[PDB]
């Protein structure tokens, strides 16, 4: 029993941009407060948690360009 | 029982930017405050923990391109 | 049962950037504050814990440009 | 205004027993077993707890007579 | 305004008992097993706490007559 | 305003008994066993705690005729 596979997948592609000009980003909230309670945690597997965050964020790229892929080959 | 694999991916992408100019930009959030509570803590696997974070956070790359890739071939 | 395995990927992709002028960036937050209690901690394996972080960052690359890659090939 | 309270209970009562023998009074349990499980505690007044009694009793008087009595005048 | 109590109570009672013969008064238990688990505790008054006792009382008294009373006057 | 009192409680009261023979009390529990387990403890006031105790006890008395009383006299 032959068994041939050929994976042979081709990408040409270009993400482009053109921006004139970034400026005069301003970002000025007026603040925050966060509040949390409990008594007992029993975590057990792959927990991810978060308890309690206050981000404030400013983030002004040029670019930002992106580009992802997944290739997966399986045999059994 | 003859088995043959030829997992041959190309790629020729190119990701560009442009950007004329970067420039004035302010970040000026008024405070902030948290507050967390609790008892006990019992973790066991792979937890990813985080309890009152507090971030702020100013980024501004003239780039930010992003390009990721993943390859997997499994045999059994 | 010959088994024969070909792999073989090729990779000609450029991350490019251009930005004319980086500048005037401020990052001026008013303060903060964070406050945990608990009483007991029990941690078993792989944990990874953050409790009580207040960061500010600035970060202000002139390029940024990153590029992940991940080649697993597997066999039994 | 005139007050005048006389308070003059009088009381003879007597309490009596007679009892031929006591004897051959066996107590013979086959055992036993608690188990309580909890975290937290908070008690904030007065609290009476018991928490995982195994009493064995064998209460055997020759009497027995018990007699409680309970007066209280008030005034205001 | 005259104010006159007389608290005058009067008691005769007598509490008596006759038993022949105490004897014979086994108390064999066949053992036993207490098992008690927390984590923490607070109590803040008058807190009566009894975690994890084991009693085994044999109390044979001849007589046991009790007898108890109170008397409260009170005045404002 | 005049006030009197007159607190002029009387009593006559006897507790008797009569035994005639106390013999062959045995006591013999199989044993037994404790366990406690607890982290922290915060004790604020007039905390009456007892943690795992093991009593065996034979009270054996030949009257136990016990007589309680309280007077309490109150004036504001």
Wanted: charged share 25%.
């Amino acid at each position: 029993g032959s068994v041939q596979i050929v994976y042979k997948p081709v990408d040409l592609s270009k993400v482009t941009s053109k921006c004139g000009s970034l400026g005069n980003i301003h970002h000025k909230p007026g603040g925050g407060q966060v509040e949390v309670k409990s008594e007992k945690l029993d975590f057990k597997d792959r927990v991810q948690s978060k308890i309690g965050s206050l981000d404030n964020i400013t983030h002004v790229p040029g670019g930002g360009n992106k580009k992802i892929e997944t290739h997966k080959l399986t045999f059994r």
